[PDB]
Amino acid sequence: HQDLPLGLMDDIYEFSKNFSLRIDELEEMLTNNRIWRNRTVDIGIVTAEDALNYGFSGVMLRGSGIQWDLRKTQPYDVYDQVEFDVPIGSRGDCYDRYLCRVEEMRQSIRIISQCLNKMPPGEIKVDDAKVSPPKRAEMKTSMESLIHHFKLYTEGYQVPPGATYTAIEAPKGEFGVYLVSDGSSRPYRCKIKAPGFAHLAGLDKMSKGHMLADVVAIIGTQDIVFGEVDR
């Protein structure tokens, strides 16, 4: 919508400078803690093949050793221009998935460092006033700009008819949308693929032969937000 305010990038740099230490303090409390390990190690084990067939994604796949990350395999935006490592687990349990998330946080800091250094100049929205609204100064001076502002904010832009399934590596796994266009300016159908929908469907499987308190840890390791599960 808008360009970064002047001075924002320096502040993001200041935050990113100190963040790894904050992750280090988190690990000091949990990583080697025998109580934390007793609550997580060998809890909710899922095999690589079962994870794929149950429709898992994200850390739920990578905790079982599956080498899959949509940012690597099917990159979008500029993810193919940044360097990072995908954390992979070996035992497929809650503890390995916990370590994957903590390592993914470190890699996010690594990626943020490259974005701050490689940020290029230029415009922020597609220079195409039939999709992206023109600048307010243009809208108040140019006849074409005002017309396009008026139409984009009332009818909206029309999308050519068609259907796409588009997915990204969301923090919770593969988040996708099956978007159907009928040629008008309103979507005809919009199915939302929430990564937690399939994950919560696997809770029954993952909890077999565990204690009542291990269910708490297993819903925890899947990281469920019922906003996306329920839509």
């Binding site: 307010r136 100064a137 809208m139 108040k140 001076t141 005002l146």
Partner: protein, 94 residues
């Protein structure tokens, strides 16, 4: 130009006021009727007409990009002022 009706209720700049028999004015009992008292019709009529030396003048409301879309106003008629349809400022050829 706020004013009160016979019942003592203030009339809004839109001309709204509950009539005598209207029960809906019970909502103000023990409270107040929110009324803005800077009537725009009266404030814009206090502005002095601007004298210009051309048949056509443009108005953007002032402030450049902080105003309204720029429009051009014809001043050929000498029986009336040219008014801006966005901000209500008036112009007259001198």
């Amino acid at each position: 130009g706020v004013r009160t009706s016979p019942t003592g209720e203030k009339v809004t700049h839109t001309g709204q006021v509950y009539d005598d028999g209207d029960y809906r004015k019970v909502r103000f009992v023990g409270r107040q009727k929110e009324v803005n008292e800077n009537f725009a019709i009266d404030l814009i009529a206090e502005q002095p007409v601007s004298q210009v030396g051309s048949r056509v003048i443009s108005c953007d409301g002032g402030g450049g990009a902080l105003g309204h879309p720029r429009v051009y106003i014809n001043l050929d008629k000498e029986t009336k002022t040219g008014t801006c349809g966005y901000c209500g400022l008036q112009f007259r050829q001198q």
